[PDB]
Amino acid sequence: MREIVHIQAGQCGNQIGAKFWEVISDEHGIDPSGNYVGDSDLQLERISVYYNEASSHKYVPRAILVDLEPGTMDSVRSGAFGHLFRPDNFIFGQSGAGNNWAKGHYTEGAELVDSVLDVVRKECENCDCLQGFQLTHSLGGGTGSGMGTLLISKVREEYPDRIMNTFSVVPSPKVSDTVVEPYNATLSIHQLVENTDETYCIDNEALYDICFRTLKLATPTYGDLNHLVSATMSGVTTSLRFPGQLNADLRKLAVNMVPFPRLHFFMPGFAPLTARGSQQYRALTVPELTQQMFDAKNMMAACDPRHGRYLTVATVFRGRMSMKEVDEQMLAIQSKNSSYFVEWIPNNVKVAVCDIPPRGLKMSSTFIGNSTAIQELFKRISEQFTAMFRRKAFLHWYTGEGMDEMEFTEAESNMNDLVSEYQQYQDA
Amino acid sequence: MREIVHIQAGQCGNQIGAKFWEVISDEHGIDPSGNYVGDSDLQLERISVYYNEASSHKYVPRAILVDLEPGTMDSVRSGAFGHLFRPDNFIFGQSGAGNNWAKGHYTEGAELVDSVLDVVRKECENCDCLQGFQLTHSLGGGTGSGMGTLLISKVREEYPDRIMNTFSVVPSPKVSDTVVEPYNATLSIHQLVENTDETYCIDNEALYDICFRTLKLATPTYGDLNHLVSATMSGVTTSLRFPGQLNADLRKLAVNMVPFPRLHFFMPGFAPLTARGSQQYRALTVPELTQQMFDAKNMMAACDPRHGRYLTVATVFRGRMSMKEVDEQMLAIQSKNSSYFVEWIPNNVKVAVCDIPPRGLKMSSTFIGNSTAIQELFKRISEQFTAMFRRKAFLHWYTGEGMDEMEFTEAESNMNDLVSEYQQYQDA
Amino acid sequence: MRECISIHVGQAGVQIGNACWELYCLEHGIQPDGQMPSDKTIGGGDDSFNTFFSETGAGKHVPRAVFVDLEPTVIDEVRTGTYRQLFHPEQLITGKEDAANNYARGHYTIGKEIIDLVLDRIRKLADQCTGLQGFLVFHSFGGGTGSGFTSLLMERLSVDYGKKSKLEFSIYPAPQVSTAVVEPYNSILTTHTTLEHSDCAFMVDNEAIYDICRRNLDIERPTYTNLNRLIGQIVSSITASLRFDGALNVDLTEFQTNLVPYPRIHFPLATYAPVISAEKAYHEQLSVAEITNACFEPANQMVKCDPRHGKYMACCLLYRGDVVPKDVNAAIATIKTKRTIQFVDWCPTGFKVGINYQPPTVVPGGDLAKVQRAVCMLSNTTAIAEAWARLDHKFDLMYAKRAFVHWYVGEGMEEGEFSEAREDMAALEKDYEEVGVDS
Amino acid sequence: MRECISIHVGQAGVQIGNACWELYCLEHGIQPDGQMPSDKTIGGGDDSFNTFFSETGAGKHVPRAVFVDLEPTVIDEVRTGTYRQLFHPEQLITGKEDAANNYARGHYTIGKEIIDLVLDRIRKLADQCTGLQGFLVFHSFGGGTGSGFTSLLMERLSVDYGKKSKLEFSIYPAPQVSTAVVEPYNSILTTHTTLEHSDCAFMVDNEAIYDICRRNLDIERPTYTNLNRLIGQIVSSITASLRFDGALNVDLTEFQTNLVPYPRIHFPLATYAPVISAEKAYHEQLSVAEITNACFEPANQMVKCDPRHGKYMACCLLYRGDVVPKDVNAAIATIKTKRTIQFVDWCPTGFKVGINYQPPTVVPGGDLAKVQRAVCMLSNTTAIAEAWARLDHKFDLMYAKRAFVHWYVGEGMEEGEFSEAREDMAALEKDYEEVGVDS
Ligand SMILES: C/C(=C\c1csc(C)n1)[C@@H]1C[C@@H]2O[C@]2(C)CCC[C@H](C)[C@H](O)[C@@H](C)C(=O)C(C)(C)[C@@H](O)CC(=O)O1
Ligand SMILES: C/C(=C\c1csc(C)n1)[C@@H]1C[C@@H]2O[C@]2(C)CCC[C@H](C)[C@H](O)[C@@H](C)C(=O)C(C)(C)[C@@H](O)CC(=O)O1
Ligand SMILES: Nc1nc2c(ncn2[C@@H]2O[C@H](COP(=O)(O)OP(=O)(O)OP(=O)(O)O)[C@@H](O)[C@H]2O)c(=O)[nH]1
Ligand SMILES: Nc1nc2c(ncn2[C@@H]2O[C@H](COP(=O)(O)OP(=O)(O)OP(=O)(O)O)[C@@H](O)[C@H]2O)c(=O)[nH]1
Ligand SMILES: Nc1nc2c(ncn2[C@@H]2O[C@H](COP(=O)(O)OP(=O)(O)O)[C@@H](O)[C@H]2O)c(=O)[nH]1
Ligand SMILES: Nc1nc2c(ncn2[C@@H]2O[C@H](COP(=O)(O)OP(=O)(O)O)[C@@H](O)[C@H]2O)c(=O)[nH]1
Ligand SMILES: [Mg+2]
Ligand SMILES: [Mg+2]
Ligand SMILES: [Mg+2]
Ligand SMILES: [Mg+2]
């Protein structure tokens, strides 16, 4: 019925996307070879949304890997669950972007966009009724931030009716690994607000905090962070793959989330998260999970929800729970946190319940929230951009690729307009 | 590769040159007959610089012996290492100079200069890439000072792009075995200052002092004095014959030695020099050799360097030693003796290191100094010349050979200018 | 697919290249004769050695390096020693007469004689090169050949290709230690090629390495061999990302992206740590935080300048071994909290992190001790301007009296050329000071 | 190659020549018959005897000497002595009547009649030689033949060759001891020809040699034969360097250039040391310094004049035997320090050193003792003028009365030449004092 096409761009997108497919395969009971080894019938009822049937009983995902370097593909291909992908879907460059945004959009990005548009067009006609596309990339890099932005604009023109989903991370305030991060982030934001239906912001610093205080882990790893992101992705689109008492597809959530086209920035979250020694003293009840959703340290973003107000909240429940309980706790939270909710919107909570629980857990749920506190994240990026653009530092590299100085000014102005719109709704 | 042509003129040059080839043959392990009996491959790697290969594994020196009397050649031929030289290289006169500069340069040299020009010319085409010429002669004599000077001009005109070396002795202030020493010495400095790139001054009085106190020898011999001169000769061109960590050929040393074309007079020095009794008490360290090199008693010239400032200093090390130790020793010497070195040049030390040590010695070094105290040696010669020229003493002997009175005056005026330039920069 | 070409010019370059290639073969398990025991040395081979070693025939690996010198004495040792079979004989090019510490001889008289031959060898290697990332050159400022021939070589490479980044590895003259009288003249005249043709110049000082070996390595009398080994480790760590695999990899192009704020500012400095002996290894722990702090100290720097006087503009950190990203982030925060270290206001984020997996390799019979972690520091600071001042003062005093000028003039130089180079040196120092001024 | 011709004229010349040639043969080993024994057998004698003798046939040597005299009695002794076979019959030239102590008789009355045969003999000897170093002439001023024939013969030699040195050995008349009544006339008349032609004349006085033999050699009454034996030693030592090898060698062409500053001043003196007997040799330790002091002693000088009255202009030092250069340098340094010996102001260096390996040879039956060292002194001084002054005063007294003048006039002399000779002689004395005037 409904099919979703997955696109991975950049080193960060490929690593996160690789872990995402492993979780999906485990949920659907697909072995790394490609066969079905499950013990249920509901697993194959909606397998066409992500997997394409092949000869005998093999299935291949609708995932396309895009990068300007061959190193990422080699690690993914040789890694676990790497041979299950289609070999033709592997598209890689040879020169690389060098963490430069301009290389992947005007100089060398145009030399490979045509190749990747052929594959996605071929995949689009296969689906009986496609619903949208999801893209994983990083806004701080050069390949994913640049090439991914170009792909979004190109795909939007061909299909201006499908939903656009972007799981893109943003530079952290304290943790930083690149010098030219502010330039890349500002340029990519200019296009996301005008071409992407909804974005999900993930902060690496917030992920480290979760694994340090909530998970109580000693040595966090990049694989651990990718697992948290992958879990959120499954929760968002669990209604399309499994039946439920009250299901809500991607379009249903989008209508109830965004009140205006320009306000489509959300903060993700997942519950419950307990350590290995706290399993005995933890109770798997609806009251316990609900409390964790409206919590500062459980958020995957550095922004503090208590600073601003919650515009619209959408939570999806997985498992078997009574509808009476889930219809009361959210009302109690809204009443108790009336100071943290907007006034002109009577109801700010969207409730969706799914029947199939995840692997190894009796009950689970995901939290997705639209709040005005996200404006703080863009405020810091604007301040960093102005400081570096004041002295025209690290600008000859960007200028030499073919861009213009006035392009930077336009991107800064639009980002300043975005936070201004968020200011007027919360203050009033 | 690079080869050097050696010319011997006069009795002093023949005796000194004969001892010089003995040291070179011992260093290269060549027996007097002419067969290689060495035990190292490095000896034959760069043997073409001084020896010309022949049939039956025989080598002949690239040396020419020039004299106006046959007595010196007979002693050299019948002496040790006499048959090694090529018989065709023996060109001798029959009349002699009689300690007269006029006869050697005008009356007698002209008849034999053409014959000796054939032999020196013939060696050049056999030479692959000649580097320069070294000539040994005595300024106080008549043959070497007179005719040997004429040979310098002839070679300069034919080869105006090659360095000229002259390891020559100078008349001593107190030691004097001839009556017309100032007349011959004055008439030779005029030509040397024009057609020579580097000149080394040897004083017999200074050599006797070293053999009396530094070496504690009971009775001196002319062979012992010639051994010191030959040792200095080998140390100058050790880089061209053996490899090292830091190499420096004659041209490399020459450019760093002369700041101006006219100032090209240096004083040599060798270290260590100890008696047999003190051999078991002294140590073999870099600081031990440095102290002797910068001592007035070890200087080979009668001039005392403590009365003037050193312009440039050349030091070549032989043996295995650390580069850190040698770097500090010369820097410390310059720092401590700040008043003894020139001011407008920051560094006055050139360092060269040769891996191969001399025979029967772990480490050794040769000292070359372009001090400003060399003008005293020319000053004492001028006083003797003026005293005899005032009374026109012995002028008829020189005039009878075709010389003119005005020619003597020109040589005196040029010599006075030479000491003025040396004093000008020293007192600047 | 990605490969690099190394060029060595002069006596200094050849010796450094001999030590650098000695470690390169050991890291990849290549015997000096040329056969790699692939039966026991199991490796990928896609980029482990293809970047630097090109396979030919069956079981033969030849380095992609060119050895150029105007005197045959230095090169003949390479053609005679243990590594004679490693290098292709045509790659070693020898002359007949050296420059004799004269910039003019190596650039106007002797350089033009063999310039055609060396260019042909580079072109031949470029034809076999599928994709070339850049060129690495090793030379010295003091020597005439190291300053004259190198300047003439880079001017031909810039015209020939004009699109490949070139890295420079040069030895800066020491302030109080010198081995020649005409060193200041050569240093000033060679600044033209290091400012316009070279995209990034790495400078080391012999005096600084001597102090490091005496105090850290406990070597009372270090030699040239020990000095070259430390320099070789710097080059290996820089190119380790292109040869091995790691969580975060930084290539040659990415180095200039974050370390070159302005086109005329491309003179950073290198720092390596930890360097300790075997005796102190057993009595100390080499943590991520500890090694990072040692790099920022002025005593461990490879240059004799004082970093505290100047200010930092761009920094790059390379990690090798069992380095985890979590420890690096914590260590960076502590560095930014110390008030001794100062950073420019216009650059809020000036840290680049590159983590590799291959641990450092120790050459048998060497001086360094086996360690599990290593950090290569490349920082562009304004304290470099102090180094220019010391060399400028010596040149002014010597040129005032016109000492040794006639030697350069007679070989084809002009008195006006010296004045022009003086203005360029002063302009470069002024630009460094201007950027460091606070706003 | 190096050859010389010796000419003996007069009774004195032949007598001295007989003693000199005996010394020469013994130094080389030639037997009086003229056959070289197997001890030498012409071994290494390229210049040992070629300079003096010549090889004819096999086992026969002939000296290159010409014996010319106006009376046959003196020549008869040579033809009757043991050395008759050694000399060639044609070389010995006799005469009919002597000069009878008359300068004109040996110049005009008889000189030109027999001089024709002498010239041919010299020409024949000259053609045999290849390179002629010069000529040696022995005569006496007092003798008529030694003053008349010598003057005419010397003039003809200059006309023929005029390019070879002609050293002269002459005996000056004693201030008091005399055996003739026309000695002042003969001595004065021959001064002009010696100054005009001879480049260097060595003057000796019989009185001085008598005192040396009486005191130093401890002889109660010296004879003429003993005097001649001493004279041969200086001549042998003078030409020792030409025939024997040594460290520093002085040839016959170096004596003039190192002794005469002006052409007119060519009258040096001679001194030989040590001269002792065998008994004194055992009780005396000969040393280099000791012999040098004896040479400068006026008592040991061979001229009656006192050198301390005058000044030294040029000095020569010839060493024979085991002599080292170091000892000579120290010895001459002490001489200059002594105040008693005075040197000319315009001559800073006036010492010539010559060392010969061959030790002196002692003829059997001679009073000279065997000493390993010997020094020959050839010094030019202004004190020689006093000796000339004595004879000049005697000539003035005789010429005033015109005693025995008619004897010279009868044979062809004129009173004008006698006056001219006095004027020429007085000019020589005046020039000697003029040069000796200080600044
Ligand atoms: C099953 C469970 C919690 C639980 C069960 S009943 C109760 C109350 N809470 C979680 C897994 C959870 O599905 C996620 C979101 C999966 C999230 C994965 C977590 C966050 C870690 O990264 C992961 C790699 C771990 O370190 C391991 C070892 C798997 C665990 O410690 C994490 C851990 O606590 O396991
Ligand atoms: C080996 C050595 C010195 C030394 C070793 S460890 C130390 C400290 N100093 C030198 C030899 C050296 O070769 C020269 C330059 C020696 C040069 C030759 C000298 C000048 C003399 O001519 C030579 C005959 C000598 O008098 C002798 C006594 C033989 C000397 O060479 C003695 C002697 O061995 O002296
Ligand atoms: N670290 C190090 N430096 C060296 C080494 N060899 C030479 N140098 C440097 O090089 C300088 C000597 O001059 P070179 O660079 O060799 O001169 P060149 O390149 O041969 O050029 P020319 O002198 O004209 O022949 C010294 O001051 C050293 O600083 C070495 O092995 N290690
Ligand atoms: N030394 C030395 N001198 C001698 C000897 N015999 C003679 N005389 C010198 O000769 C002088 C004697 O006169 P001669 O010289 O023989 O006269 P002459 O040369 O033969 O000439 P005439 O007398 O004219 O025949 C003496 O005054 C001596 O000085 C001698 O045997 N030995
Ligand atoms: N959570 C997470 N972040 C990553 C991962 N890989 C890279 N990143 C982040 O991505 C940033 C670097 O982006 P980069 O890979 O250079 O982007 P590219 O230029 O498109 O390849 C770093 O700051 C990392 O924090 C990953 O596997 N997980
Ligand atoms: N060092 C040294 N000096 C010598 C030797 N022989 C002579 N002399 C010096 O040279 C000077 C004489 O030079 P001479 O040989 O006559 O020169 P010539 O006439 O050109 O051959 C004397 O003052 C000696 O001191 C020798 O073998 N060694
Ligand atoms: Mg990356
Ligand atoms: Mg000589
Ligand atoms: Mg060189
Ligand atoms: Mg007679």
PDB file of N, CA and C in Angstrom, chain A residues 11 94 98-99 175-180 182 208 212 218-220 222 387-388 390-391 393-394 396-397, chain C residues 1 247-248 254 256-263 325-326 329 346-353 437 439:
ATOM      1  N   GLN A  11      28.966  10.601   5.825  1.00  0.00           N
ATOM      2  CA  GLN A  11      29.483   9.579   6.730  1.00  0.00           C
ATOM      3  C   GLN A  11      28.539   9.348   7.904  1.00  0.00           C
ATOM      4  N   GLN A  94      34.857   9.826  -5.593  1.00  0.00           N
ATOM      5  CA  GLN A  94      36.267   9.499  -5.434  1.00  0.00           C
ATOM      6  C   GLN A  94      37.119  10.639  -4.893  1.00  0.00           C
ATOM      7  N   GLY A  98      35.705  17.227   1.629  1.00  0.00           N
ATOM      8  CA  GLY A  98      36.617  17.908   2.526  1.00  0.00           C
ATOM      9  C   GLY A  98      35.904  18.834   3.489  1.00  0.00           C
ATOM     10  N   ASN A  99      34.828  18.331   4.103  1.00  0.00           N
ATOM     11  CA  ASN A  99      33.980  19.063   5.060  1.00  0.00           C
ATOM     12  C   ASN A  99      33.608  20.461   4.563  1.00  0.00           C
ATOM     13  N   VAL A 175      30.687  20.492  22.231  1.00  0.00           N
ATOM     14  CA  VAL A 175      31.441  19.513  21.455  1.00  0.00           C
ATOM     15  C   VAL A 175      31.525  19.986  20.009  1.00  0.00           C
ATOM     16  N   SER A 176      32.746  20.086  19.489  1.00  0.00           N
ATOM     17  CA  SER A 176      32.965  20.518  18.115  1.00  0.00           C
ATOM     18  C   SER A 176      34.212  19.838  17.577  1.00  0.00           C
ATOM     19  N   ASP A 177      34.108  19.278  16.371  1.00  0.00           N
ATOM     20  CA  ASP A 177      35.220  18.586  15.736  1.00  0.00           C
ATOM     21  C   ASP A 177      35.699  19.259  14.457  1.00  0.00           C
ATOM     22  N   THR A 178      35.035  20.320  14.005  1.00  0.00           N
ATOM     23  CA  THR A 178      35.396  20.997  12.768  1.00  0.00           C
ATOM     24  C   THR A 178      35.401  22.502  12.997  1.00  0.00           C
ATOM     25  N   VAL A 179      36.307  23.187  12.303  1.00  0.00           N
ATOM     26  CA  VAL A 179      36.460  24.628  12.467  1.00  0.00           C
ATOM     27  C   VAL A 179      35.401  25.413  11.693  1.00  0.00           C
ATOM     28  N   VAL A 180      34.966  24.907  10.541  1.00  0.00           N
ATOM     29  CA  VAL A 180      34.086  25.653   9.647  1.00  0.00           C
ATOM     30  C   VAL A 180      32.644  25.194   9.822  1.00  0.00           C
ATOM     31  N   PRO A 182      30.091  26.499  11.676  1.00  0.00           N
ATOM     32  CA  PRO A 182      29.025  27.514  11.542  1.00  0.00           C
ATOM     33  C   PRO A 182      28.667  27.859  10.104  1.00  0.00           C
ATOM     34  N   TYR A 208      25.218  12.052  24.552  1.00  0.00           N
ATOM     35  CA  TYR A 208      26.232  11.677  25.532  1.00  0.00           C
ATOM     36  C   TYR A 208      25.703  11.814  26.954  1.00  0.00           C
ATOM     37  N   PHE A 212      25.181   8.908  29.948  1.00  0.00           N
ATOM     38  CA  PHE A 212      26.000   9.114  31.136  1.00  0.00           C
ATOM     39  C   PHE A 212      25.194   9.149  32.426  1.00  0.00           C
ATOM     40  N   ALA A 218      29.654   3.640  31.209  1.00  0.00           N
ATOM     41  CA  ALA A 218      30.980   4.175  31.499  1.00  0.00           C
ATOM     42  C   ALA A 218      31.649   4.732  30.248  1.00  0.00           C
ATOM     43  N   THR A 219      31.699   3.941  29.174  1.00  0.00           N
ATOM     44  CA  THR A 219      32.369   4.323  27.932  1.00  0.00           C
ATOM     45  C   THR A 219      31.355   4.333  26.796  1.00  0.00           C
ATOM     46  N   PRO A 220      30.764   5.485  26.485  1.00  0.00           N
ATOM     47  CA  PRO A 220      29.855   5.558  25.338  1.00  0.00           C
ATOM     48  C   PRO A 220      30.603   5.408  24.024  1.00  0.00           C
ATOM     49  N   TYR A 222      30.031   5.547  19.453  1.00  0.00           N
ATOM     50  CA  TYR A 222      29.210   6.067  18.363  1.00  0.00           C
ATOM     51  C   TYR A 222      28.099   5.097  17.985  1.00  0.00           C
ATOM     52  N   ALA A 387      30.446  36.182  14.006  1.00  0.00           N
ATOM     53  CA  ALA A 387      31.814  36.397  14.466  1.00  0.00           C
ATOM     54  C   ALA A 387      32.830  36.022  13.394  1.00  0.00           C
ATOM     55  N   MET A 388      32.628  34.883  12.728  1.00  0.00           N
ATOM     56  CA  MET A 388      33.567  34.453  11.698  1.00  0.00           C
ATOM     57  C   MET A 388      33.393  35.231  10.400  1.00  0.00           C
ATOM     58  N   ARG A 390      32.574  38.305  10.225  1.00  0.00           N
ATOM     59  CA  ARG A 390      33.008  39.682  10.430  1.00  0.00           C
ATOM     60  C   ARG A 390      34.381  39.928   9.816  1.00  0.00           C
ATOM     61  N   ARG A 391      35.304  38.984   9.989  1.00  0.00           N
ATOM     62  CA  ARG A 391      36.661  39.109   9.475  1.00  0.00           C
ATOM     63  C   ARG A 391      36.875  38.339   8.177  1.00  0.00           C
ATOM     64  N   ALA A 393      36.885  35.208   7.662  1.00  0.00           N
ATOM     65  CA  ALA A 393      37.803  34.109   7.924  1.00  0.00           C
ATOM     66  C   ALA A 393      37.315  32.831   7.257  1.00  0.00           C
ATOM     67  N   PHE A 394      38.255  32.086   6.671  1.00  0.00           N
ATOM     68  CA  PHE A 394      37.961  30.827   5.986  1.00  0.00           C
ATOM     69  C   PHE A 394      36.901  31.021   4.904  1.00  0.00           C
ATOM     70  N   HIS A 396      37.890  32.270   1.524  1.00  0.00           N
ATOM     71  CA  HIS A 396      38.435  32.066   0.186  1.00  0.00           C
ATOM     72  C   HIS A 396      38.183  30.651  -0.317  1.00  0.00           C
ATOM     73  N   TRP A 397      38.150  29.665   0.585  1.00  0.00           N
ATOM     74  CA  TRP A 397      37.816  28.305   0.175  1.00  0.00           C
ATOM     75  C   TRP A 397      36.394  28.227  -0.366  1.00  0.00           C
TER      76      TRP A 397
ATOM     77  N   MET C   1      43.844   4.364  -5.257  1.00  0.00           N
ATOM     78  CA  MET C   1      43.092   5.417  -5.927  1.00  0.00           C
ATOM     79  C   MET C   1      43.668   6.757  -5.479  1.00  0.00           C
ATOM     80  N   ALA C 247      38.108   5.920  12.848  1.00  0.00           N
ATOM     81  CA  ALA C 247      36.767   6.468  13.023  1.00  0.00           C
ATOM     82  C   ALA C 247      36.621   7.811  12.318  1.00  0.00           C
ATOM     83  N   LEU C 248      37.612   8.687  12.461  1.00  0.00           N
ATOM     84  CA  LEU C 248      37.627   9.982  11.792  1.00  0.00           C
ATOM     85  C   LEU C 248      38.938  10.115  11.035  1.00  0.00           C
ATOM     86  N   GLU C 254      41.687  18.331   3.569  1.00  0.00           N
ATOM     87  CA  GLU C 254      41.032  18.770   4.796  1.00  0.00           C
ATOM     88  C   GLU C 254      41.997  19.496   5.726  1.00  0.00           C
ATOM     89  N   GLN C 256      44.279  21.774   4.897  1.00  0.00           N
ATOM     90  CA  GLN C 256      44.308  23.183   4.533  1.00  0.00           C
ATOM     91  C   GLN C 256      42.951  23.858   4.672  1.00  0.00           C
ATOM     92  N   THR C 257      41.871  23.082   4.778  1.00  0.00           N
ATOM     93  CA  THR C 257      40.545  23.677   4.915  1.00  0.00           C
ATOM     94  C   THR C 257      40.393  24.399   6.250  1.00  0.00           C
ATOM     95  N   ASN C 258      40.931  23.823   7.326  1.00  0.00           N
ATOM     96  CA  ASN C 258      40.760  24.369   8.663  1.00  0.00           C
ATOM     97  C   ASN C 258      42.009  25.037   9.223  1.00  0.00           C
ATOM     98  N   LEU C 259      43.158  24.908   8.562  1.00  0.00           N
ATOM     99  CA  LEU C 259      44.408  25.469   9.060  1.00  0.00           C
ATOM    100  C   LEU C 259      44.890  26.658   8.239  1.00  0.00           C
ATOM    101  N   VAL C 260      44.106  27.112   7.266  1.00  0.00           N
ATOM    102  CA  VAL C 260      44.505  28.229   6.412  1.00  0.00           C
ATOM    103  C   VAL C 260      43.402  29.282   6.433  1.00  0.00           C
ATOM    104  N   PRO C 261      43.314  30.100   7.484  1.00  0.00           N
ATOM    105  CA  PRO C 261      42.303  31.170   7.494  1.00  0.00           C
ATOM    106  C   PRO C 261      42.479  32.180   6.374  1.00  0.00           C
ATOM    107  N   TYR C 262      43.716  32.477   5.987  1.00  0.00           N
ATOM    108  CA  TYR C 262      44.010  33.425   4.926  1.00  0.00           C
ATOM    109  C   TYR C 262      45.022  32.825   3.964  1.00  0.00           C
ATOM    110  N   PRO C 263      44.953  33.189   2.680  1.00  0.00           N
ATOM    111  CA  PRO C 263      45.851  32.565   1.693  1.00  0.00           C
ATOM    112  C   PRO C 263      47.328  32.791   1.970  1.00  0.00           C
ATOM    113  N   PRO C 325      36.412   8.795  21.223  1.00  0.00           N
ATOM    114  CA  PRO C 325      35.949  10.183  21.062  1.00  0.00           C
ATOM    115  C   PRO C 325      35.528  10.844  22.363  1.00  0.00           C
ATOM    116  N   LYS C 326      35.019  10.074  23.329  1.00  0.00           N
ATOM    117  CA  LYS C 326      34.553  10.663  24.581  1.00  0.00           C
ATOM    118  C   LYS C 326      35.693  11.326  25.345  1.00  0.00           C
ATOM    119  N   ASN C 329      36.813  14.778  23.782  1.00  0.00           N
ATOM    120  CA  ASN C 329      35.923  15.902  24.053  1.00  0.00           C
ATOM    121  C   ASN C 329      36.155  16.471  25.447  1.00  0.00           C
ATOM    122  N   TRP C 346      38.031  36.053  16.739  1.00  0.00           N
ATOM    123  CA  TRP C 346      37.259  35.812  15.525  1.00  0.00           C
ATOM    124  C   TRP C 346      37.077  34.333  15.213  1.00  0.00           C
ATOM    125  N   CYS C 347      37.761  33.441  15.925  1.00  0.00           N
ATOM    126  CA  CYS C 347      37.632  32.000  15.709  1.00  0.00           C
ATOM    127  C   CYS C 347      37.107  31.341  16.975  1.00  0.00           C
ATOM    128  N   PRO C 348      35.793  31.123  17.091  1.00  0.00           N
ATOM    129  CA  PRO C 348      35.279  30.466  18.304  1.00  0.00           C
ATOM    130  C   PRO C 348      35.630  28.992  18.376  1.00  0.00           C
ATOM    131  N   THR C 349      35.528  28.269  17.264  1.00  0.00           N
ATOM    132  CA  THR C 349      35.870  26.854  17.200  1.00  0.00           C
ATOM    133  C   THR C 349      37.120  26.693  16.345  1.00  0.00           C
ATOM    134  N   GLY C 350      38.208  26.245  16.965  1.00  0.00           N
ATOM    135  CA  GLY C 350      39.460  26.078  16.255  1.00  0.00           C
ATOM    136  C   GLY C 350      40.140  24.752  16.521  1.00  0.00           C
ATOM    137  N   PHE C 351      39.354  23.696  16.717  1.00  0.00           N
ATOM    138  CA  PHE C 351      39.883  22.374  17.020  1.00  0.00           C
ATOM    139  C   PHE C 351      39.375  21.371  15.995  1.00  0.00           C
ATOM    140  N   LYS C 352      40.286  20.558  15.468  1.00  0.00           N
ATOM    141  CA  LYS C 352      39.957  19.481  14.545  1.00  0.00           C
ATOM    142  C   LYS C 352      40.504  18.178  15.111  1.00  0.00           C
ATOM    143  N   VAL C 353      39.668  17.143  15.132  1.00  0.00           N
ATOM    144  CA  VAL C 353      39.999  15.873  15.766  1.00  0.00           C
ATOM    145  C   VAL C 353      40.036  14.786  14.702  1.00  0.00           C
ATOM    146  N   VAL C 437      45.956  41.158  16.231  1.00  0.00           N
ATOM    147  CA  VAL C 437      45.437  42.305  16.965  1.00  0.00           C
ATOM    148  C   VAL C 437      43.968  42.076  17.289  1.00  0.00           C
ATOM    149  N   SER C 439      40.062  42.832  18.206  1.00  0.00           N
ATOM    150  CA  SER C 439      39.083  43.769  17.668  1.00  0.00           C
ATOM    151  C   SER C 439      38.227  44.363  18.782  1.00  0.00           C
TER     152      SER C 439
END
